[PDB]
Amino acid sequence: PKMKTHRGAAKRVKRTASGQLKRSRAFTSHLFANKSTKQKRQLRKARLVSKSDMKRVKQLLAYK
Amino acid sequence: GKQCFVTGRKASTGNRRSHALNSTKRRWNANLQKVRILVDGKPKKVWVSARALKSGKVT
RNA sequence: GAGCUGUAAGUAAGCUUUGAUCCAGAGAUUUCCGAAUGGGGAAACCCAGCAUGAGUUAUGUCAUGUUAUCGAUAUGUGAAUACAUAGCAUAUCAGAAGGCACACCCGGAGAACUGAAACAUCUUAGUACCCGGAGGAAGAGAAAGAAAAUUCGAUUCCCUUAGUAGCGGCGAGCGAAACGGGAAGAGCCCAAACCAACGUUGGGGUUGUAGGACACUCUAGUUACAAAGGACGACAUUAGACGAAUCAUCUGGAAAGAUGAAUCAAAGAAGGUAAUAAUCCUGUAGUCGAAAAUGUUGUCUCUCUUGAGUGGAUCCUGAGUACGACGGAGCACGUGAAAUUCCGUCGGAAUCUGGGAGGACCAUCUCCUAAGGCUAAAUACUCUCUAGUGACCGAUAGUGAACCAGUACCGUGAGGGAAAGGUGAAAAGCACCCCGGAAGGGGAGUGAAAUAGAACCUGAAACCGUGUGCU
RNA sequence: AAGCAGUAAAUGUGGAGCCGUAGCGAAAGCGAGUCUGAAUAGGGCGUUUAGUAUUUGGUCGUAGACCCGAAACCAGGUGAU
RNA sequence: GAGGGUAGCGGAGAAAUUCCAAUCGAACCUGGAGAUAGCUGGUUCUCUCCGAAAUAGCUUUAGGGCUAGCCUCAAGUGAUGA
RNA sequence: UGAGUAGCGAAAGACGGGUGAGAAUCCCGUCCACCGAUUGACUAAGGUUUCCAGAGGAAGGCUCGUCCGCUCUGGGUUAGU
RNA sequence: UAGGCCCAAGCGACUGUUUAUCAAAAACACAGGUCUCUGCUAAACCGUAAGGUGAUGUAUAGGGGCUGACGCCUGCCCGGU
RNA sequence: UCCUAAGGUAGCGAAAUUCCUUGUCGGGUAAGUUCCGACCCGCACGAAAGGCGUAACGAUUUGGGCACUGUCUCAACGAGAGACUCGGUGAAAUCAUAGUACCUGUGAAGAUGCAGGUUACCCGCGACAGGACGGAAAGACCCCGUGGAGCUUUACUGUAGCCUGAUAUUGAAAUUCGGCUUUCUAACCCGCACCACUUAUCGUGGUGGGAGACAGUGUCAGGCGGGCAGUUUGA
Structure with a gap:
């Protein structure tokens, strides 16, 4: 089904413009x-x- | 077959928890007391809870 | 509307145009076991009582009814114990039971392997298994709601919100709702105040823009909820009937193929016939048709029926209930600052100037009115019946089972489980002669074909034999 | 997208919703600039400012996930011939 | 000898981990179930071009894994390579 | 393939006459041998037609078979004690 | 068809029992001794409810531990559990 | 002279117990690491997981004798079944293809198959067991896996039970610094007696006794708990 975000990783990073x-x-x-x-x-x-x-953790944060 | 003759109270089921949050099954019984209460015919002994014995109930 | 006596051929004896066989509706008969129910029992067996009848000089034997338990109701009905009450006897009851589709639904009770690269909180999972109760669906359902707009207005299902907000040895992991867009869409009955009769049954009364009681002028059948019994025409289903159009030659065993002349089409879907058929056959398009049974609907009859505003002196609006502490559970939410709601124990309110909610809590605002009940539709599934479909299988495949398969067989038992399709168009299934005890064969016949002869379409490789060129 | 109409089609209709056109900051917030800071003083991230819908191929995640193979655990039953 | 009773989180045992249908340090059958397996074994047609590693760091880690080093393909800069 | 190799499941048979397509193995006779607290006579459990007669030789019988607990057809079980 | 015998030593008093299917023994049991629990709805045991065994028994009785015919005996220690 | 609760008594002792050890001395033998009798430097005997003895008993374990014998010096002959030839019937484990010599070397370090040399005409039948690291069973020994199962405990976390206190069922009187403490009966209890249902004493009801607000039961709390369960125990 839908992929699931890493909740513990979404609490520690933010996405920049680039x-x-x-x-x-x-x-x-x-x-x-x-x-x-x-x-x-x-x-x-x-x-x-x-x-x-x-290269290792890019898929864990795809909706972010 | 153990139930309150008036209110209908009976046993429940739940968990017993330790300080480490382990769980096992246990039961919560009802305070059923064997009493003689007036029915249409001969007064026969029935199970009646103590909660139903408050505020005035026949005996 | 002419043959028929099921596989299935065989002979034997028969029925049928005075309508056989066959197809559809409605009837009658329906051994024994089995919930099994007179009693018993190792299912398909044995042994009885009572009342009627058949037969016998009489006994012995036979036939037809009835006799379980529990439950609800009329009736007679001492007990111990004066009265009464358990018990007891008989009568009535389309009262109950069992099975079921290992599907869908509601409730009781409820694991582990596994993941976290170990493991105890957590996860697998409220899943598998077990038990109970149903229905054709069930469950839910008419705001003590969602929210913060110049507000909506019962419930259920789909899309999105969104892998967002949040929960979490903050690890593995778990995971929403409101708003908006759609399908479908009706709402109602009781308790209390109060009045009349002998605690009873009638009437009156159902709410938040505050309703009702009392006192003031007063009249749409909804049988799916909303109250419950019936006569009353049209369709659908269960047998069926009509239904257009082609000839000739060649090859061949056989023409539907090849070659020429034609025809039909609201019909060129399909299957068969000696090979490849719109015009040979059953069919197709289109029309026609119901004794009798069942279902769904509509037209009178039939059956119930009280309507709105002004006054609020006074009265009513669901109690061991709400809620609190302790111990648990459920809400996406693991006790956390945990509201909202359920169980066991112990305490325990208020009464319209009342009560609840808006995520601990208080004050102000906004919305609603708990502790009684009922309700179609949109939704889920297929043991089945009818009519069809496929860039699904084609006998080691497809269901375990195309064939006498839950069978041969295996186990004390629960239970496990196969292998096996194909002559020919038509049996026309080899009369007759020869070798032999027979099986088997050589001719002769059937057939287009017998190296198609039932161990039968085609007939590969492994492996086994006979005879021969070079060594 | 759901739905509706259509031959279980093609595609009509349907604009709830989604991605992009603008970032920075924990947030209030400001905005081609924002955060830190007494101070663009210096420094960080932005000012590229062309995407978006369908689909062939590669790889990944959730489902048994390339195939065959345990010693074991749990639940309900069958057995003292 | 015949007729019976005790059933697996159990029963029986003059006691051996002994027996409970040729099986017992915990019977058999059917389900969860295609349990899990960082471990062995296997994985089916043909040509053309290029072409490794057996090292470091950390690790309940040592025959396992992750990042870096070494290979290949596409795009860009272009002299920065020997 | 091993290979015409291992084995053919405790033991005394010989002759004459028959039948027959076919006789070490079937029928009849004589002699000889073995058991005899049993290899004899009943019978419970269990099996379920294996019992009798007339026919047969495909398969089963560890060889053969004209014969059989095997194949075909027809029969057989009688209770007041 | 029908005991070989003798002289010495270890272990177990004896007759019995045991690893169906590699161990029959010095192992288990045993008659005797000792300690401890139990006043009767007894203690102990199965379910862990009803109902049962103990027992249709009553301290010369019932359950558990150790030792193991018989003879002579069984010494010191209550910091620790 | 040091310590501790005590420092092993009687009996026995190279023992089913002794490493040194074949301890030392006697007996037995021509010759005795075994056996019997003594001694005690008892590594590491010892008094009910008993000490020392002991008639009878044993398909027990040891040492020495008489009698006997193919066990042996040292083998030979005879009988029968198999084995060998012929008539009938006729399997199995195993197997990459095979025309399958020896010596010295070489090789993943022990060759029928590779190098060099030496031997050997083609095909059978009866025998032997050196090799083919011969065949049957994915080594039970050893190590590994953050695999499994059974068992133990003063490993961690729980739990069935069993003790204890508060509170509900639970009531009436009266002494003493609402409470300790005493009587009473109506709740509750009796595998106590009698009567009835009833030919039954399972059950129910009635009436006498016993006990009594205790006990039993519900909820909350503290303690004990390898009896039982799930797991961990590094490189």
Whole structure:
């Protein structure tokens, strides 16, 4: 029948105009005393999903 | 054959849950008491629940 | 409207134009077992009571009715125990039971293998299996609704919303509704106030723009819900009847083929006939037709029938109900901030200046009026009957079964389960002679053909034999 | 699309609905520009701004999913000749 | 010897994991059912062109998988290759 | 294919006369051999016509068969104790 | 047709029973000893309801554990369970 | 002198128990790792998962004797059935095709089939068992699979039961700091006696006794629980 979206993946990415996916960074939940100021300030910025990862998870998000 | 002669209450069925959310089948019985109540003829003992014994019921 | 006595041929004896056989409607007969029901029992068996009759000097034997249990109703009806009440006896009952299509529907109860690459929450799944109750459908159904517009107005089914909102060891995974577009489309009856009669039965009364009671002037048959028995013409189904048009030659065993002359068509669908037929046969298009039975509809008869606004002093509008705590379940929603609704236990309201809902909760606004009942249509399925269809099979295929198949056979039992089609157009199925005890064969005949002779259309390979060129 | 009409057709009719013409941001929101930020200061994603409907071929997902093969588990029955 | 009783989440056992229809560390039959199988075996006609790997990282991972490296086809830039 | 190979399921037969297409194997006779707390006579269970007579030799009989528990046709089971 | 006998040692008192189909034994049972539970709708067992066994019995009786004829005996320890 | 609850008593002991071990000494034999009798450095006996003995019994396990014998030195002869020849009838496991020699080498490291050499005219019948890693059973040993089943426990999570408290059924009086505690009878209970249905004491009803707001039963809660169930136990 109809394909099913990955609900856990649709909560973590967004679709851009060119077709890429915008993601958020890891290693930012707690234990901030063990990371330097430069590390924590540069983990506030966003990133994009790599093409290596895109080749594997593109079908899981097709309606998004 | 165990049922309330007036209200019609009887047993149910459900689950028993542990702290880990395991489940097994169990039953919920009714508080049926054997009483003598006036019928057209001789008073015969029937099963009547306690809920039907409130607010005034013949005995 | 001329043959017939089923496969099936055989002989024997018969019936039929005074209408056989055969086809359709309506009847009568219908052994025994089986729910099996007089009792018993290892189904298809044995043994009885009572009342009538046949036969006998009489007994013994026979025939026809009736005799289960439970349930509902009239009747006689001591008990223990004065009265009464269990029990008991007889009568009446198209009262019940069992089977069923391993399909569709509603309810009770309810797994596991599997996935999560292990597994316990979760998933498989409210699925398989079991039990009960039905119907031709069932279930649901006339707002204590959906919502936020200048609002709609019972239920069911399809399209979309949408793999969206959400749920989730937030893992695997699960997954909506309202709006809008369509199919189909009617709504109603009770309890209470209150009045009249001897607790009873009649009348009055059914709601949210607030209705009803009381007091004020007062008259459309819907037999599918809405109240329930019947006489009253047209069709359909179950046997059937008419129904156009071609001749000649050649090959051949046989012409429908080839070659020439024609004809019909509201009929050139199909099947057969000695090979390939619009004009040979059964048919086709189109018309005609019903003793009798059943179904569906319509026309009187027939049967019920009370209608709306103004006044609201006062009265009524469903109770151990709603709801709360504890333990569960169901809502797409795993207890989570969980509304909305169901079960068991324990508590437990209000009365129109009332009650509920709008996703914990309070206030304001908007919508509705729970705790009684009934209801066609659009929807699901096919054990079947009738008439048809296919870029579906063609005997190791197609149903397990084209043939005497749920059969041979196998098992104590539940249960498992095959193989096997084809002469010829027509039996015209080889009279007769020869070898032999017979099977088998060689001639002679039938036939277009017998290397088509029933172990019979065609007749491949493996394998087995006889005779021969070169070695 | 459902539905309706039509020979179980072709295609009429049907504009609920869907994709595209504009992005960015968690959201309120603004808009050829938006987010972060005191500050286009710098930086990220956009300003290409041609799609859309049917269909042949390749591959994927949900269904047993290229074929044959377990040791086992669960449910209802049959058996003490 | 004859007639009977106890049935598989069970029965019987002077006790051996012994027996319950030639089968028992849990009987047989029919269903869930085409259970699951990262494991063996198999997979049917013909030509033309090109043509590998047996490595790294991570892994309840080690004869399994995912990304990168190496092969092929289509489009683009074009001198960036040796 | 193995291959005209293994086997042919505990044991004493010989002769004469018949029948016959065909006789080590069928019928008749004589002699000899074996059992005899049984290889004898009844009979329950179980089987279900295997019982008798007249015919037959396709298949079954571990060889043959003119013969049979095999094939065809016709028969046979009688209770007040 | 019909016991071979003797002298010593281990294990089990004895007669019995057992792996149908590779184990018949020193293994199981046994008569005896001991501990413990049970006042009668007894304890224990099957269903885990009704109804039953125990038992138409009543502590010289009934259920469970260990040991195992007979003779001499059976020593120390209550931190731990 | 250290520790602990106690530090093994009587009996027995190279034992169905002893590794060293064929312990050491005697008996038996020409010769004794087995056997019998003693000794005790008991790796690691021991008192009801009993210790030490013990007539009778055993298709039990051991060691030594008399008698006997083809078991043997060391084999030979005879009888019968099969086997061998002939008449009748007539299968099976196995099998890629086969005109299928030896030696030394070589090869996936043990060749009828490859190299070099040496032997050998074609076809049968009776015998033997060296090879064809000979045939019958997808190795039961070993390892692997995030395969399965049975069993155990102070592995994890549950559960059938069995104890305990609150609350409903559940009532009337009266002492004491609505409650502990005492009497009573009407609820509820009796596999207690008698009567009736009724030829039955299963059941029901009645009447006497016993017990009594307890017990039994419903809902909620805490504890015990390998009796039973589902699973995990790394590379």
